[PDB]
Design a protein around this ligand. Structure first.
Ligand SMILES: [Mg+2]
Ligand SMILES: [Mg+2]
Ligand SMILES: [Mg+2]
Ligand SMILES: [Mg+2]
Ligand SMILES: [Mg+2]
Ligand SMILES: [Mg+2]
Ligand SMILES: [Mg+2]
Ligand SMILES: [Mg+2]
Ligand SMILES: [Mg+2]
Ligand SMILES: [Mg+2]
Ligand SMILES: [Mg+2]
Ligand SMILES: [Mg+2]
Lengths: 144, 66, 185, 141, 57, 75, 142, 62, 57, 100
RNA sequence: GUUAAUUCCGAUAACGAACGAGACUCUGGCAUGCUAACUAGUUACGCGACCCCGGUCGGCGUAACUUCUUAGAGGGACAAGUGGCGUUCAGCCACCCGAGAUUGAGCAAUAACAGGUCUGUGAUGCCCUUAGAUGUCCGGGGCUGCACGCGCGCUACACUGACUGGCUCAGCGUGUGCCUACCCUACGCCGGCAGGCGCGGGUAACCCGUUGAACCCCAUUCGUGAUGGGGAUCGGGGAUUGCAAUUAUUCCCCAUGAACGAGGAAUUCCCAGUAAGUGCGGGUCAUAAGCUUGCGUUGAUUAAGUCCCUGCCCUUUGUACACA
C-alpha cells in the first residue's frame, strides 16, 4: 500500500493556485490563500477523508468535494465563529474568502479606509505600522 | 583560612594562665570548662577559644610557652 | 550480589584498557561500575574528584550543550542507551570497550600553549576531558540540521573514533592539534 | 486481583478509551470535530476519537482523587501557551470539553456530583475501571 | 471588629500608627525635649506613654 | 545551496531495492533508510513497520525519538 | 505478633520521602503503586539499586510503603532511593542483629554514599542585580 | 621515532604567562634512573604517566 | 557651632557613655557646604550591635 | 468550656515568655491544656530601591517583618481564663480569645 | 614567615589604645533526644467501596504517637583527632570520624566626588512672575510621532526538534483595603475560546490548595524543504476593565506567513545545586510583565591557577606632576 499509484498528481490545480501533492493533504491544502492549518483540517474532516494519504494520492471527485466544502462552508456545518470574513461590511454575510478574492477584498477594505480618510487608512497610505506600535527603533529596513 | 584573632588568642592565654590546674587535653571537656568559667557570649568563639586552649596545652605539655 | 551490568545489559568486566597512561583517569572497572549513567553528582567539589566519576556518566554529562538542552540529563541517558545499543548491533562488541578505545584514540597526546606558542604535552586528565568533549561536539556537529539522529551520530562517531579512521571529527582535530604541536615544537 | 494503580496508566487509558467506544453510549457533542481542545493548543486533536480517550483519562483521575470539577479538570489538562515573541506561560484547558465529559460520565453512570462540590467516581465506574485494570494486567502477562 | 481586618495588615497598621504618632509628637515637642513613646492596648482602652525630658513643660 | 530530493512513495526500483537489501543491513533505522534510498523519513517509518509486520526485520528497541531494527540471525 | 514498624525519611533537593516498613512479605510499593511504573521510567534502576544490590533475600520478611511529597521527578526518585535503603537499615538495627546492619550498611555505602546519607545541597538565593544565583546582568559600556 | 611514556615523580610549580601549564619533572618508566623536567598542560597529579611524543627536549626551570 | 557641639560632647560622655560622634553638615564658614565631625570614645560601626548599642538621631 | 486563646507578635522572646506564663498559669490552676501550637512564621517581604533618585548601581533593600503566631486551647469556664489573661502581658504581644 | 584580612606568631624607640577585618544577626544543612499540636500529620482500629486471606482509597470516624510538617529552647565543629610540612610558633596540606572540615547574605571605617536627587516631602536658602495660572480644575492632544545610530531584553534560526494525545512532580508567597468605593477564588449551568450567570469558602497551616506548573517522561504524526521551524506584519469578527480604547489597552477566534541557515570587528556574566533551560509568586495593577525582585524544578563542561591583559593592596625607587 506504499507504492506510488498511477494518476498520482504531483501538482493539483485548485482555485488558480498550485497544490504540491508530495505533502500530506491537510498541510498541502494550506498552499492557497484563505485557508490555514486548522481550517484545512476541519474542512477535510467534514469531507470524510483518510488523512494518511497525500494530496496527490486521492481522486478528482474527492478534490471537487473538498473545493465545494471550502467554498461553501455554512452549507456543510462549518461554524460561524470559524470564518475569516465574519459579518462583512458590504453584503453582511459570513464567508470564508479565498485565494484570488482574498487580496481583492483586502484591497477593498484598504482603499475604503483610505477613501473615508481614517487614521489607519492614512497610515496604510503612508506605509507605516497601523496597529499602534512604536516606530522609533524597530522596523527600519523596509522603510529604507 | 583558620587564623584565630587577637580576641581569641589573648583570652585563651588568660584562661590558661589563671586556670591551668582545671584545664585538660580534650576539646569537649575544656569547652564546658570555659563555658562555666567565662561569660563568652556565643558558641562559635566559645569553641574557638576552647580549641586554642587545647592547642596551647599540647604546647605546654611539650615545653614552656612564651 | 556481584555482576552489576551497565543498563542491566552491558558487563563492566571483559573491558581491557590496553594503555597504561589512562588507567586511573578512566572509570569502567568494578568499584566505578554503576547501573545507570545517572548519578547524584557531588563530583565538582575537589580538584580530581572529577576523575572518579564513571566515564559513561561523564559522556552523559558532556553531551548536554548548546543552549536548547542544558540540563536534560534523562534525555541524554536515553541518547546514550540507544547509542550503545546501535554501537553493539553495528560493530559487534562491548560498547564500553569501544568507548574506552574511542577515548584512548581520541585524546590528544600533546597540545600547543603560549608560554608564537610552545608545544607541551597534556596531563592525562585533560586528555580524558578533551577526548570526551571532542566526541560530543563531533556528534553534535554531525547531527545538526540532519535526518540522521544524534543517537546515531554519537554511535558512528564513537566507532569511527575507535577505529581512528580519520573520518571521525574528534580524530581529525586530534591529529591536526598534534601536527600543529610538532610544528610549533 | 489487581486494581488501577497496579498497572501502567498509559495503556490503561487507551484500553478504557476502546471500552467506551465499543460501549457506544457516551453522548458525544457535535462540535467535537470543530473544537480546539484548549486555548493553548494550536491545531485540532490529531486522533479523531479523542473524546473517548479524554473520557478515559478524566475517569482515571476521578478514580485517583475525587472532588474534581470543571476547573480542576482545566487545571489538570493545562499546558504551555507559547505567546509568540512574548514568553510562554501556563494556561488552562477548555472548560466546555471538561464540562461535557463530566456530564457524559454522569449521563452513563460512572461519576456523580458529590456534595463538597465536584464529581467523584461512583461504585459502578469503580468496578468498571478495576475490571479493565485486571484486563490490562492479564494482557501484559 | 465588624470588618475583622487581617493581622498581616493589623501589624503594619499599628506600626504606621506608631510612626505617625512618633513624628507628630516629635514635631510638637521639639522644644520640649521629646524622647519617645510606648503604646499599650488594654481591653477597651489604650494607655500610651509619652516619654520626655521637660515633663513640666 | 544543495537540496535533498526525497521521493514520498515507492517507485518500483526503490521498492524491490528495499525488499532485497534492507533486510540484510546490520542497523536499520528510518534515518539510515532515508539516506540510502533517498526517501522521506515518514515513508521510511511506514515501510519499515511494514517490513516488521511482514516479518523480515527485527525490532531491537522501540522509542518515541528513535526506532532501531536489525536483520535476522544467520543461524 | 508485634508490630515491627519503622518509618524512615529520605531527602533530596526538596523532595522528602518517608517509607513505612512492617513485617510481611516482600511488598515494595510507592504512593499506592509498585516500583516498575513510576515516571521517569528511564530512571528505574535508581529505584532498583537497593533491591538489586541486596536481592530479594533481605526484603523477604519486610513490606515497605513509601509516601513521597515535594521537589521534582528525579529528586523524588532519589528520595525514594535513599529512603527505602535507610528504612531497611533502621529496621535491621531495631529488630535483628546489628552485624547484619553492619553488613547491609557497608554494602550500600561502598557502592555509593548518597544512598544512606543525604545531600546537603539546596537551591541558593537569587541576589538582586542578577538573573540567577550568582550570574549578573550584562554590563553596558559606551 | 619512538613514543615513550614517563611517570611524574614530583610537581615543581606552575609556569606560563597566563599560568596554564604545570611544570613537573618526570621519570621515564623503562629507564627509571633518568629524569627530565617538562611543562605539562592541564590538571596534574603526582604519580601519573604522560605519553611523551618527543622524549629529548627539556623545558628550562622557571 | 563648635562650642555647641563640644558642649554636647562633654555633657553626654560625662552623663555616661562609651563614646559618641556628632556630625554637623551644612553651610557654615562661608557658602560652600562643609561638615564638622566630633568623635571620641568607643564607637562600634558594623554588625548587629549597631542596633542595640548605638542611639542615633 | 472549650476555649481558644491566640497569641501573635512580631517579637518572639516576649511572646514565648507570655505563652509559657499562660501555660504555667493553667498548670497552677490545675486544668487540662493542650500544648502551644506554632503555626508558621508569616514573613512580610518588601524589596525597594535604595536610591530615592534613579541612578546608582541598582541596589535593593530587603525589609522583612516576621510574625509569630501561637495557639493555646483550654477546657475551662470563661471566668477563669478572664482571671488569667487579664494580668501579665508584655505590650508587644496581641492576645485574643474565642469562646466557642 | 603566615593568613581571605594592619590576621596572627614574632622582631622592635616605641608603649598603651580606638575604628574597619573579625566578632555579630538572619538564612542553608544535622537531630527517630526535649517541648507540643482537630488551622499539620503518621501508624493502627472499626466501618464503607472495589478486585481475584490479601491489595488499593487525599472514603468515613476515633486509640496511641510526633518519623514526615510546623518552631522554640538546646545541642553540634573547634583545624578538635591522626600523618607530614614550618622558627616546630603563627599556620598549611592530606585523611578518618563525620549532616557539615570554605552555604549564602545583611551590617560595614578614616578621608572624600562640587556623582545623583529642589520631579519624595508641609526639609529647604535665594531668585522668578504682580490674572491674561508655572496654583489648581476640567475638555482634547502629547509623553507612543520615525530617513537613522546605540543599550537592556524576549522569541527564534528546528529532528537534542515541532505538533497532537497521555503520564507525573515543587517552593517562595498573595488574597475583601481609613479615605479606598476595586480581593483570592473552589463548585454548578451556558458558550469553541475569550468569557457570562448562579449560589458558596476565606481577614487565612482552615478556603482557593494535596497549590494536580512548566521543562522533563511516554506514545503518535512530521522528514532537512524557509518545512508542521519562526510568528513579525496585516484584514475581519467576538469578549473583558473603564466615564471613555481612535494612535489597534488587554484576551480570544479565523485568515495572512516577513526576516532569520548559529551571526563581522568587538564584548558581557560565571566556577556547585553554580551557568544554563524551565515555569510559578510579589511589586507595578481598574485593565497588566518582553521588566524587576523572589522562588523552586532539570542540572552540567571546565578550574583549585596566574599576573600576560584590565584593575586593586603593600614596600622600595624616580618625578620638571599637585584642578595630581
Ligand atoms: Mg537530528
Ligand atoms: Mg499539562
Ligand atoms: Mg567592629
Ligand atoms: Mg563583620
Ligand atoms: Mg555635580
Ligand atoms: Mg521676570
Ligand atoms: Mg518616556
Ligand atoms: Mg509554528
Ligand atoms: Mg511556515
Ligand atoms: Mg569586562
Ligand atoms: Mg519598570
Ligand atoms: Mg630619575
Amino acid at each position: 500500500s506504499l507504492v506510488i499509484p498511477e494518476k498520482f498528481q504531483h501538482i493539483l490545480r485548485v482555485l488558480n493556485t498550485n497544490i504540491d501533492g508530495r505533502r500530506k493533504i491537510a498541510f498541502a491544502i494550506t498552499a492557497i490563500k484563505g485557508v490555514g492549518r486548522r481550517y484545512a483540517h476541519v474542512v477535510l474532516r467534514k469531507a470524510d477523508i483518510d488523512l494518511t494519504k497525500r494530496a496527490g494520492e486521492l481522486t478528482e471527485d474527492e478534490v471537487e468535494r473538498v473545493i465545494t466544502i471550502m467554498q461553501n462552508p455554512r452549507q456543510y456545518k462549518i461554524p460561524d465563529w470559524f470564518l475569516n470574513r465574519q459579518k462583512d461590511v458590504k453584503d453582511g454575510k459570513y464567508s470564508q474568502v479565498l485565494a484570488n478574492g482574498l487580496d481583492n477584498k483586502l484591497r477593498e477594505d484598504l482603499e475604503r479606509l483610505k477613501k473615508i480618510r481614517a487614521h489607519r487608512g492614512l497610515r496604510h497610505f503612508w506605509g507605516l505600522r497601523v496597529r499602534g506600535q512604536h516606530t522609533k527603533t524597530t522596523g527600519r529596513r523596509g522603510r529604507t | 583560612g583558620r587564623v584565630r584573632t587577637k580576641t581569641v588568642k589573648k583570652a585563651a592565654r588568660v584562661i590558661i594562665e589563671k586556670y591551668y590546674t582545671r584545664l585538660g587535653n580534650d576539646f569537649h571537656t575544656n569547652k564546658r570548662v570555659c563555658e562555666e568559667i567565662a561569660i563568652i557570649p556565643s558558641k562559635k568563639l566559645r569553641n574557638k577559644i576552647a580549641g586554642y586552649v587545647t592547642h596551647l596545652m599540647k604546647r605546654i605539655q611539650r615545653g614552656p610557652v612564651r | 550480589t556481584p555482576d552489576i551490568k551497565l543498563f542491566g545489559k552491558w558487563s563492566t568486566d571483559d573491558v581491557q584498557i590496553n594503555d597504561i597512561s589512562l588507567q586511573d583517569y578512566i572509570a569502567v572497572k568494578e568499584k566505578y561500575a554503576k547501573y545507570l549513567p545517572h548519578s547524584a553528582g557531588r563530583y565538582a567539589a575537589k580538584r580530581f574528584r572529577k576523575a572518579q566519576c564513571p566515564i559513561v556518566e561523564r559522556l552523559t554529562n558532556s553531551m548536554m550543550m548548546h543552549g536548547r538542552n542544558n540540563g536534560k540529563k534523562l534525555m541524554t541517558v536515553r541518547i546514550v542507551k540507544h547509542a550503545f545499543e546501535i554501537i553493539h548491533l553495528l560493530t559487534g562488541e562491548n560498547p564500553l570497550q569501544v568507548l574506552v578505545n574511542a577515548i584512548i584514540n581520541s585524546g590528544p597526546r600533546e597540545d600547543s600553549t603560549r608560554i608564537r606558542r610552545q608545544a607541551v604535552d597534556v596531563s592525562p586528565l585533560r586528555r580524558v576531558n578533551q577526548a570526551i568533549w571532542l566526541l560530543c561536539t563531533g556528534a553534535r556537529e554531525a547531527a545538526f540540521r540532519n535526518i540522521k539522529t544524534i543517537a546515531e551520530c554519537l554511535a558512528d562517531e564513537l566507532i569511527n573514533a575507535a577505529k581512528g579512521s580519520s573520518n571521525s571529527y574528534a580524530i581529525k582535530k586530534k591529529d591536526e592539534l598534534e601536527r600543529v604541536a610538532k610544528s610549533n615544537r | 486481583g489487581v486494581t488501577v494503580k497496579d498497572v501502567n496508566q498509559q495503556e490503561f487509558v487507551r484500553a478504557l478509551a476502546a471500552f467506551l467506544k465499543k460501549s457506544g453510549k457516551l453522548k458525544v457533542p457535535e462540535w467535537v470535530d470543530t473544537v480546539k481542545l484548549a486555548k493553548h493548543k494550536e491545531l485540532a486533536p490529531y486522533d479523531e476519537n479523542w473524546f473517548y480517550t479524554r473520557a478515559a483519562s478524566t475517569a482515571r483521575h476521578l478514580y485517583l482523587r475525587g472532588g474534581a470539577g470543571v476547573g480542576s479538570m482545566t487545571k489538570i489538562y493545562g499546558g504551555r501557551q507559547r505567546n509568540g515573541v512574548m514568553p510562554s506561560h501556563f494556561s488552562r484547558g477548555s472548560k466546555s470539553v471538561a464540562r461535557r465529559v463530566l456530564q457524559a460520565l454522569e449521563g452513563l453512570k460512572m461519576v456523580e456530583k458529590d456534595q463538597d462540590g465536584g464529581r467523584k467516581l461512583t461504585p459502578q465506574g469503580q468496578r468498571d475501571l478495576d475490571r479493565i485494570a485486571g484486563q490490562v494486567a492479564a494482557a501484559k502477562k | 471588629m465588624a470588618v475583622q481586618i487581617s493581622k498581616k495588615r493589623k501589624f503594619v497598621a499599628d506600626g504606621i500608627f506608631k510612626a505617625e504618632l512618633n513624628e507628630f509628637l516629635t514635631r510638637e515637642l521639639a522644644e520640649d525635649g521629646y524622647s519617645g513613646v510606648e503604646v499599650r492596648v488594654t481591653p477597651t482602652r489604650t494607655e500610651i506613654i509619652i516619654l520626655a525630658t521637660r515633663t513640666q513643660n | 545551496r544543495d537540496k535533498l530530493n526525497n521521493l514520498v512513495l515507492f517507485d518500483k526500483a526503490t521498492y524491490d531495492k528495499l525488499c532485497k537489501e534492507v533486510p540484510n543491513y546490520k542497523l536499520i533505522t528510518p534515518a539510515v533508510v532515508s539516506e540510502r534510498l533517498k526517501i522521506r523519513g515518514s515513508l521510511a517509518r511506514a515501510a519499515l513497520q511494514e517490513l516488521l509486520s511482514k516479518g523480515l526485520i527485527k525490532l531491537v528497541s522501540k522509542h518515541r525519538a528513535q526506532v532501531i531494527y536489525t536483520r535476522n540471525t544467520k543461524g | 505478633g508485634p508490630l515491627q514498624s519503622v518509618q524512615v525519611f529520605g531527602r533530596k533537593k526538596t523532595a522528602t520521602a518517608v517509607a513505612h516498613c512492617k513485617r510481611g512479605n516482600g511488598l515494595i510499593k510507592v504512593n499506592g503503586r509498585p516500583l516498575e511504573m513510576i515516571e521517569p521510567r528511564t530512571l528505574q534502576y535508581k529505584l532498583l539499586e537497593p533491591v538489586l544490590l541486596l536481592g530479594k533475600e533481605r526484603f523477604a520478611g519486610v513490606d515497605i510503603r513509601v509516601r513521597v511529597k515535594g521537589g521534582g521527578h528525579v529528586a523524588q526518585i532519589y528520595a525514594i532511593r535513599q529512603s527505602i535503603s535507610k528504612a531497611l537499615v533502621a529496621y535491621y538495627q531495631k529488630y535483628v542483629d546489628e552485624a547484619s546492619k553492619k553488613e547491609i550498611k557497608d554494602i550500600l555505602i561502598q557502592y555509593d554514599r548518597t544512598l544512606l546519607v543525604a545531600d546537603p545541597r539546596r537551591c541558593e538565593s537569587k541576589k538582586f542585580g542578577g538573573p540567577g544565583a550568582r550570574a549578573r546582568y550584562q554590563k553596558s559600556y559606551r | 621515532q619512538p613514543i615513550k611514556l614517563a611517570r611524574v615523580t614530583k610537581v615543581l610549580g606552575r609556569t606560563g604567562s597566563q599560568g596554564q601549564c604545570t611544570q613537573v619533572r618526570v621519570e621515564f618508566m623503562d629507564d627509571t634512573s633518568r629524569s627530565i623536567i617538562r611543562n605539562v598542560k592541564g590538571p596534574v597529579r603526582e604519580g601519573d604517566v604522560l605519553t611523551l611524543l618527543e622524549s629529548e627536549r627539556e623545558a628550562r626551570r622557571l | 557651632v563648635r562650642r555647641a557641639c563640644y558642649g554636647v560632647l562633654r555633657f553626654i560622655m560625662e552623663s555616661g557613655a562609651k563614646g559618641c560622634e556628632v556630625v554637623v553638615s551644612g553651610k557654615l564658614r562661608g557658602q560652600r557646604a562643609k561638615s564638622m565631625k566630633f568623635v571620641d570614645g568607643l564607637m562600634i560601626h558594623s554588625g548587629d550591635p549597631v542596633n542595640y548599642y548605638v542611639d542615633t538621631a | 468550656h472549650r476555649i481558644r486563646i491566640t497569641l501573635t507578635s512580631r517579637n518572639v522572646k516576649s511572646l514565648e515568655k507570655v505563652c509559657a506564663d499562660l501555660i504555667r498559669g493553667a498548670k497552677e490552676k490545675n486544668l487540662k491544656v493542650k500544648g502551644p501550637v506554632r503555626m508558621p512564621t508569616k514573613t512580610l517581604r518588601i524589596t525597594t530601591r535604595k536610591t530615592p533618585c534613579g541612578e546608582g548601581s541598582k541596589t535593593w533593600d530587603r525589609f522583612q517583618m516576621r510574625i509569630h503566631k501561637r495557639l493555646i486551647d483550654l477546657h475551662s469556664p470563661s471566668e477563669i481564663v478572664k482571671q488569667i489573661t487579664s494580668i501579665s502581658i508584655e505590650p508587644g504581644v496581641e492576645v485574643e480569645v474565642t469562646i466557642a
